[PDB]
Amino acid sequence: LFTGVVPILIELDGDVNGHKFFVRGEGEGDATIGKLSLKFIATTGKLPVPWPTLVTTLVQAFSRYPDHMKRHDFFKSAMPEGYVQERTIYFKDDGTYKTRAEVKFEGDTLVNRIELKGIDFKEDGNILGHKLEYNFNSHKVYITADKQNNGIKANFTIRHNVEDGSVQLADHYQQNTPIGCGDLPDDHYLSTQTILSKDLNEKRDHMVLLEYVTAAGIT
Amino acid sequence: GEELFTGVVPILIELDGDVNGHKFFVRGEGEGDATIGKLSLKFIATTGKLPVPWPTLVTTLVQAFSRYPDHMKRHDFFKSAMPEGYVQERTIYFKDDGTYKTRAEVKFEGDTLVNRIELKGIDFKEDGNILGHKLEYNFNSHKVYITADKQNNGIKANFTIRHNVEDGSVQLADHYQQNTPIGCGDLPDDHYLSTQTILSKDLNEKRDHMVLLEYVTAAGIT
C-alpha cells in the first residue's frame, strides 16, 4: 500500500485550558524513503499554543523500515483497516496533553483524525507564553510490542528549544491498537529529523513541515 | 464462547421502533439459561400504547440461549461469537400487509447479555390485522432453519411465523435472517431450532407491557 507516494489528510480538534481550535493538514508521504511533507493551516485563527507542541500529534506508517527490519513494521501491518494512536504527553513543570487519533486509509489517501485535550498549563509558562523557538529537534522513538492489546507501545522525550537558551521537555506515552483483524515487533527505535518553515503567500496562521524518519535498533 | 452460558445469565433488550411513522421504544429485562434453553422476560413499552400487536415484536425482541445438545455443540454459531457478539438483520414480510426491517446487535457487556435493536415498518394496511390489533395474545411453535454463510463468515435463517387472528384465521409472517460476527475468532451444518413461547401479563403493571416465557432447542442432525 506504501510502494510509492501516498496522499495525506489530517484533522485536529483541539482544546487547551478552554481555548478551542481546529487544524487541517494536507500533503504526501513516501515510506520507501521515509519522507513526509505537509502544510498545516489553523482554520480558527492564531493558535493558543506553539506549533512545535503539536508536531508529534500531527503518520508513523511512513517511517522507512529497511528490508532487514520489514517484519517489525506494525504501522503498515495494520493498513488499510488502520490503527488508533492514544498518547499522554507530560510537559515538565507545565501542563498535560491527552490525545486520541485514528489513522486509516480512505480511498487511496491516508487520513489522521485527532482529538486533543490540554489541562493544567501555566499562563506565562513556556507553552501559553509562546516562548518556544520555531524548531524541532531530532529524537529516537523507542518501540516495544504489546501482546495483550495486539499492538505496540512507545516512549520518548521531545526537547523543545526555548527562546531564552533553555530547553523544554515533553514526556510521551503512546499506545497503538489495530482497528481491524489480521506484526508485533522486537524492541527497536525510530530516529527522526524535522524542519519547520512558512509559506509567504499564506495569510493564515499555518506551518510547513518536512520530516525524515527511519527505523533502527536491530543489527 | 460456550463457557459464558454455563449458568443463568442476565438480559437487557432495547428496541427503537417505527411503523408507518409511529415511533415507539421498548425496554426488556430478565434472565436466560442456555443449558435448558429457557428465557423469561418482561417488556415495558416506555412510550405508551403500542401501534402494533406485541406478538409481532417477539422474534425481534437472543438465539444464543438455545439449548444445543452436546452432540450438536459444534454447530452453535451464536455462542461461537460471544463475548464479542454478532449482528442480526432481518426482513419480515407479513402476507397481504406490511414489512418490518430490523437491525440488532447482540453483545455481552460485563456479564449481562444485551440486544439493541432498530426496527422500521412500512406499507401496513390501516385496519389490517396488525394496525387493527386483531391478533390473539398468543405465540405458536415453529422451526427456525439454519444454514452456514461461508461468504460473510456467519449464518442465515428462514422461517414463517403463524400469528393466530381473533376471527379464527392465521396471519403469516415470512422471515429472512443474517447473522455476522462482530469480532474475529463456528459455521454449522444445516439444522433447525424448535420453539415454544407463552405470553402473559403482570397485574399491578399499569403500563402497556408483555411477560414472555420461551423454550428453544436445536435439532436436525442425528
Q: With the C-alpha atoms ordered A47, A52, A55, A57, is the resulting torsion angle positive or negative?
A: negative
| Gaps in chain B (C to N distance exceeding 2.5 A) after | 61, 185
Technique of determination: X-ray
Q: CA A9 to CA B103: how far, in whole Å?
A: 33
Please identify which residue in the block is written with the cell numbers 529516537.
A140
**A92-130 burial code (b ≥16 CB/10 A, e <16):** eebbebebebebbbeeeebbbebbbebeebeeeebbbee
- The answer to whether the beta carbons of residues A4 and A106 sit under 8 Å apart is no
What b/e string do you get for B153-163 counting C-beta neighbours within 10 Å, with b at 16 or more?
Answer: ebbebebebeb
Q: How many CB atoms lie within 10 A of CB B141?
A: 11
Cα–Cα distance measured from residue B192 to residue B134, given in angstroms and rounded to the nearest whole number: 30
Residue B137 domain boundaries: 1-222
Joined grid coordinates for residue B221 = 442432525
Tell me if A183 sits within 8 A of A77, measured CB to CB.
yes
Instruction: Please give the tally of structural domains in chain A.
Output: 1
Calpha distance B90→B157 (Å, rounded):
9
The answer to whether A68 and A216 are in contact (CB under 8 A) is no
C-alpha span between B33 and B143 (Å, rounded): 20
Question: Which of B88, B82, B90, B89 is closest to B107 using CA atoms?
Answer: B82
CB B18 within 8 A of CB B25: no
Stated in angstroms to one decimal place, the resolution of this structure is: 2.6
| A140, containing H or E segment | strand A140-146
User: CB-based contacts of A95: which residues, under 8 Å, 6+ apart?
Assistant: A16, A17, A118, A119, A120, A121, A122, A125, A127
The SS3 of residue A159 is strand
Taking the C-alpha atoms of residue B80 and residue B141, their distance in angstroms, rounded to an integer, is: 25
Q: Rounded to whole angstroms, how far apart are CA atoms B76 and B186?
A: 7
Nearest to A136 by CA among A92, A174, A178, A170: A170
- Nearest 10 degrees: CA dihedral of B115, B121, B125, B131? 30
Cα torsion angle, A147, A150, A151, A154, sign = negative
Distance CA(A194)–CA(A51), nearest Å, equals: 13
- Domain CATH number, residue B146: 2.40.155.10
Contact B175, B4 (CB under 8 A): no
A93: left (phi over 0), alpha (psi -120 to 50) or beta: left
Query: Regarding beta strands A110-119 and B38-44, do their DSSP bridges make them parallel or antiparallel, or are they unpaired?
Result: unpaired
